[PDB]
Amino acid sequence: VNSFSGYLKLTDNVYIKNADIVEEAKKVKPTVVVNAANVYLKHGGGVAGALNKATNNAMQVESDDYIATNGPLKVGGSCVLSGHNLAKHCLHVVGPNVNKGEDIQLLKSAYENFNQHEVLLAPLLSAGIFGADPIHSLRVCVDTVRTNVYLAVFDKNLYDKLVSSFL
Ligand SMILES: C[C@H](c1ccccc1)[C@@H](CO)Nc1ncnc2[nH]ccc12
């Protein structure tokens, strides 16, 4: 039993809800919130910009130190950093950004990072401003993640389309 509320159950391990991931994190304080990161951990817009804003830029300050020490992530890769006021940990995961010409096949590799954590709050990787089809992202999620994932879909219209089209 966990404290996630109001989710529709899609499979044994995947749950979905129309929600603002910032507000969800602030309410649940999950062990792990997933950020839709880029390789530079520059949290400008979309989920990343919103999460970082909610931390009063502390996420960005921590991320800049991480990059200065370690260099950029790989597309499809991840790192674990602090969750600040939102969660115990933030798993920064880089899905491919179609608006940059990156290979959509890397979306499965990106979701594989979730399997290192028993329970996660997360957005659909590569969706939104990353330019992929969210219906495809949900399919890859369900077919790749084996741990318990609670997906927050900000756009209510998109949420209804994902539910109604889910196979
Ligand atoms: C599927 C979602 C989306 C939103 C709008 C237009 C199309 C798609 C997603 C895409 O990355 N973005 C978010 N999801 C959850 N919580 C969020 N908080 C701030 C952003 C955000």
DSSP secondary structure string, 54-121?
HTTTHHHHHHHHHHHHH-PPPTT-EEEEE-TTT-SEEEEE----GGGT--TTHHHHHHHGGGGSSEEE
> 75 in ligand 1 pocket by Cβ < 6 Å?
no
For residue 20 the two structure tokens come to 């603002």
- Strands 78-82 and 148-153, by their bridges, are unpaired
Ligand 1 pocket test: which of 153, 161, 163 has the largest number of ligand atoms within 8 Å of its C-beta? 153
Long-range contacts formed by 80-85: CB under 8 A, 24+ apart: 82/58, 83/25, 83/32, 83/33, 84/55, 84/58, 84/59, 85/26, 85/54, 85/55
At residue 70, φ and ψ (nearest 5 deg) are: -110, -15
Domain of residue 43: give its range: 8-163
Ligand 1 pocket test: which of 16, 18, 47, 160 has the largest number of ligand atoms within 8 Å of its C-beta? 47
Residue 3 maps to a domain: no
Q: What is the 3-state secondary structure (H, E, C) of 117-146?
A: CCEEEECCCCCHHHCCCHHHHHHHHHHHCC
Query: Residues before each break in the chain (C–N > 2.5 Å)?
Result: none
- Resolution value (Å, 1 decimal): 1.0
Residue 125 maps to a domain: yes
Residues 92 and 116 sit within 8 Å (Cβ to Cβ): no
The total number of structural domains in the chain stands at 1
Residue 2 maps to a domain: no
At residue 84, φ and ψ (nearest 5 deg) are: 55, -135
How far apart, in whole angstroms, are the C-alpha atoms of residue 129 and residue 86? Answer: 22
Residue 1 maps to a domain: no
- Cα 17 vs. chain centroid, distance in angstroms? 13
For residue 81 the two structure tokens come to 């950093």
Per the DSSP assignment, residues forming a β-bridge with 93 are 36, 78
Residue 21 maps to a domain: yes
How far apart, in whole angstroms, are the C-alpha atoms of residue 2 and residue 28? Answer: 9
Residue 93 maps to a domain: yes
CATH (domain of 58): 3.40.220.10
Residue 99 maps to a domain: yes
Expt. technique:
X-ray
Radius of gyration over alpha carbons of the chain, in Å?
15
> 123 in ligand 1 pocket by Cβ < 6 Å?
yes
How far apart, in whole angstroms, are the C-alpha atoms of residue 149 and residue 34? Answer: 10
> Which conformational region is residue 128 in: left (phi greater than 0), alpha (psi within -120 to 50 degrees), or beta?
left
Between the CA of 53 and the centroid of ligand 1 the distance, in Å, is 15
Residues 119 and 30 sit within 8 Å (Cβ to Cβ): yes
Between the CA of 134 and the centroid of ligand 1 the distance, in Å, is 10
Residue 117 maps to a domain: yes
